[PDB]
Symmetry: D2
Subunit: 213 residues, 4 copies
């Protein structure tokens, strides 16, 4: 679509969480103009793998993005993290938003066990540090719906001759709304104000598109 597009996704609330900070960040950053003619196109995905995969395939096909930043909540993690690897297995510790679970389930017959993310991981960490944002690389995204869409996107891009499109996953901590809903019988969550989370996603987006030059 003429100018380069960064596809930015977040997820809906799920489980006992009343809010999803990845949804809030995607909503706030939609349409952001970045240097070099780049623009952010945001979308929200459902927390259910069949529908999330179908929606993500449509976005990848219709938007033909120059880079892909998938985001989601990791309640309990203290700092933003970049996923190194998407694994081709579905194994759900809690049900998805259709009440569904999967046990040791391969995502795709006759496909790789995993895909490495193709984002410029160290450049993003450096941009975060320069912006005074603590963060790190994670080497497991879980085997729930965030991992599923990471594997799904990397596989689709490779199969469509677009393996050079940088693509990865950014997990964010709880925001205040998520932390406030935790029951009194449970341990408190690390959290970040939503404005810090959104800024972290923005800084990652800016670093990704700066590198594609």
């Amino acid at each position: 679509g003429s100018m380069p597009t960064l596809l930015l996704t977040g997820f809906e609330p799920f489980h006992t969480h009343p809010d999803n900070p990845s949804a809030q960040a995607a909503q706030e950053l939609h349409g952001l103009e970045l240097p070099g003619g780049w623009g952010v196109h945001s979308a929200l995905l459902p927390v259910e793998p069949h529908a999330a995969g179908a929606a993500l395939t449509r976005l990848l096909s219709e938007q033909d993005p120059g880079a892909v930043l998938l985001t989601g909540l990791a309640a309990g993690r203290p700092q933003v993290t970049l996923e190194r690897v998407g694994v081709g297995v579905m194994d759900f510790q809690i049900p998805d938003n259709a009440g569904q679970t999967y046990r040791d389930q391969p995502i795709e017959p006759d496909a790789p066990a995993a895909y490495l993310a193709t984002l410029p991981l160290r450049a993003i960490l450096a941009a975060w540090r320069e912006a005074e944002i603590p963060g790190d690389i994670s080497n497991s995204a879980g085997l729930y719906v965030c991992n599923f869409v990471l594997y799904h996107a990397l596989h689709w891009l490779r199969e469509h001759g677009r393996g050079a499109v940088p693509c990865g996953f950014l997990h964010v901590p709880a925001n205040a709304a998520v932390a406030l809903a935790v029951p009194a019988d449970r341990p408190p969550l690390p959290y970040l104000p939503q404005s810090e989370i959104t800024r972290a996603v923005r800084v990652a987006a800016e670093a990704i598109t700066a590198q594609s030059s």
Copy 2:
């Protein structure tokens, strides 16, 4: 002075931390006018109990506060917390800023084993929640310098007939500067942006003076 004063303290950096969010919050809020004629008076304490006690005694005497909010860093905690109890023992897991440690050391011979904080704990929790700030009561402040000054202030106030002056401790998480300095071989810290920490201290101060 003639108007009611909330005494607000923070601590200097210590150990491997290059910044102390409690220092930053106290500095930002000094002079804040609160409803009912209350004003915040801030001070920065050293992380060493002899000098901290001497400085805090001078503040309690000279500033004559109507309420006392002592604050400090609790690196590793995810949310602001209010200390329920100050224990009369110094036992240091790391040295203080004079390089000193204490082992099982009573703070004052012949004094109580502990003092309960006299801040309106549930009112502060409720004010935090209304401001969308997660937080809770803590039942141990450690036995390092933050606990020391909590015990010291509660004891001084009671010994001077001022036990009715609400007094307590507010531990804050790491800010970004504290979290960014953690070595690569160590676990990452929960943290909050400084503006969130300062706002939590402000909301607590406002709840304390509203109750008084």
Copy 3:
């Protein structure tokens, strides 16, 4: 009762836990003969403060022990711990076994805010280390029923002219039974086999009675 008695207590199961390792250890060590003519007398307490206090008062009065070792479960702690202080407040994050809760409730009108434990803390830590048992001092026992009985016993002993009787609290990790019952949606617990927990309680008992000489 002629020879010196160490009073050893544990607690019944509570909450979602099917077993209490402090009960198991107290049961196994009842009647143990220790050097110097000392013998262990064990009892189990209910997880409910009114009945636990009444039972503990009867034990302190009827057994007239030379030392008191109160034990209980701290599910989530990795290593045995010795409580430094019992605080005169009841504040329950979960109900007790009568379904009861207390909020910011003073244990006793016109009594101290707290009592320091009078066990030989460093001698116990050293005995544990010599026995290759990791452990440490804890500076909060919580404000649930274990803290309640620690405060209760120290207060009773002081009020009855028996403040010199060494008295304290030993919190133990989950055993295997406790860890196996954790739901799949919850984080795993640190645990120790029951034989390690019982041995830790035994080593503490031996150090306490050795010091009373």
Copy 4:
């Protein structure tokens, strides 16, 4: 040899740890006779990927095992865990025993991003539970030397037409010796007595050969 062999490996001490429970477990279980004519063959690998890979290749070739159980220390984890996946990257947060680190380094150019472990994971979990041993599957082995040898063995087996040989990784908690050496300024480690760790490794080995 003529009878089926389960190859069991552990690692030497590394970093600040004076002992490695995986070494102790492998040493105790060497030669264990299991039902069906199976026997355990143990070996101790160095915590350095070049020498560990060379030693493991020699073991896979010379011992010709019917199953492979690689074990190692995961200091901080509370319960035994089975690794689901070995990732083709070396990225070291602490140096190895040669003082070396690797940053984002592919293990082998032109090889898969990962290999899934081929042990009967659910059967092992069920055997642990029947033996009253808490445990679970882990979805990251780290990117240090334990992950390296998991990837190395799965790749070697597949490249030699032996992908059907069940092969995986079992991380164990600290034992008492590891936990006792932690400095006073650091958080305490979950741990298990060595006899509990060794029993967990034994129960896993028995479940693996029962399935084969």
